Design an enzyme around this catalytic site. Sequence first.
Site, PDB file in Angstrom:
ATOM      1  N   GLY B  16      43.728  58.097  74.531  1.00 24.83           N
ATOM      2  CA  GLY B  16      42.542  57.274  74.485  1.00 24.83           C
ATOM      3  C   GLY B  16      42.661  56.076  75.413  1.00 24.83           C
ATOM      4  O   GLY B  16      42.120  56.109  76.522  1.00 24.83           O
ATOM      5  N   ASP B  17      43.400  55.049  74.992  1.00 29.00           N
ATOM      6  CA  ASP B  17      43.539  53.832  75.783  1.00 29.00           C
ATOM      7  C   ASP B  17      44.852  53.655  76.548  1.00 29.00           C
ATOM      8  O   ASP B  17      45.176  52.531  76.973  1.00 29.00           O
ATOM      9  CB  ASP B  17      43.367  52.621  74.891  1.00 29.00           C
ATOM     10  CG  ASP B  17      41.965  52.504  74.328  1.00 29.00           C
ATOM     11  OD1 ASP B  17      41.045  53.058  74.949  1.00 29.00           O
ATOM     12  OD2 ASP B  17      41.784  51.859  73.267  1.00 29.00           O
TER      13      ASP B  17
HETATM   14 CA   LIG Z   1      39.346  51.376  73.339  1.00 32.93          CA
HETATM   15 CA   LIG Z   2      40.078  56.300  77.717  1.00 35.84          CA
HETATM   16 CA   LIG Z   3      39.079  53.102  76.344  1.00 36.71          CA
END
Ligand SMILES: [Ca+2]
Ligand SMILES: [Ca+2]
Ligand SMILES: [Ca+2]
Lengths: 161, 161
Positions: B16-17
């Site tokens: 995700g991040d």
């Molecule tokens: Ca995020």
């Molecule tokens: Ca991402």
């Molecule tokens: Ca993100």
Amino acid sequence: TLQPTEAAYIAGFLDGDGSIYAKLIPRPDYKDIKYQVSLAISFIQRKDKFPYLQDIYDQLGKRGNLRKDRGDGIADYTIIGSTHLSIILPDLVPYLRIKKKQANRILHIINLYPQAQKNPSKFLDLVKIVDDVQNLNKRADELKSTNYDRLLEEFLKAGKI
Amino acid sequence: TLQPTEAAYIAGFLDGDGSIYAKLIPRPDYKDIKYQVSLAISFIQRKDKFPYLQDIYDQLGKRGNLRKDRGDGIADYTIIGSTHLSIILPDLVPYLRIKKKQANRILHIINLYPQAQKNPSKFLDLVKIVDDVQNLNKRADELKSTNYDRLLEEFLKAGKI
DNA sequence: GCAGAACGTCGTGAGACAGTTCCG
DNA sequence: CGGAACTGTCTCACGACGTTCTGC
Ligand SMILES: [Ca+2]
Ligand SMILES: [Ca+2]
Ligand SMILES: [Ca+2]
């Protein structure tokens, strides 16, 4: 069924590129409480990565709505409603970290809704949880949600309470 | 000391991040080949969420470096080097989906590096894999990395090959 | 001589809904 | 109705390094 590591992964991915939110929808057609509280979780990703959303979709029982392109080259997967969330969130909550609070608030809302749907005073308490969730998704220097305050005044002005 | 669901969560979060990348660092004081293939994975998050990164940091043996502020309200956690990555990635690969290819290409680089170190020809081959990882981190409509082409021209021009 | 630790940032890829239309 | 599905998008929150400082 959804295995532990699958739920763990989805939760981590949701904490990253996803969102857990609630909203108050004006319903002119409604009869006394002209609002519907909408609940949802969503995953967002660049359209080329749409296949990974499809995979989560499958693992979550094919509940929800996939969108190959929102229109801006971005794809998303949104799961709306207590029906799907009552089954999904319990499986993710033990693994959620960043959005764990929001998840519990949604679950709270789901259990209170049946008795709040046609009862102005209970509906307001439920609206307070909606603001909480919207605020949890805001930076500290952002204008806080004020749905409770606005509806309280609306309900009084309309005699509803 | 990492439980399956702990690794799966981290993998999901990283997908995700996070970011998994490789690059060439010019080294003025190096002696045959004046560059080093630097490797790393990183987690990025709005400064206000730094503590969640601190938690992952602890769960990964406190390897890497934590920055509360990159200087723009954004916090990050970076793990650099084959030493750390040769232990961490194997644990995450089973659960990574989106950046799985990048993790494996980095593991590959780790296994070929010792011999590519002082062999211009091998160093180039390894650089090709660096280009692959950088390409994996691009959209299809973007300029593909040129570390291989530029390094080859440098090597020929310097009579190293 | 070799390499990790810090710093700096363009170019977006996301988030968190607001609206509006559709369906049993 | 009662609520979910589809459309749309403003405001950032990221990414993935290139570059420079530190350490033995
Ligand atoms: Ca995020
Ligand atoms: Ca991402
Ligand atoms: Ca993100």
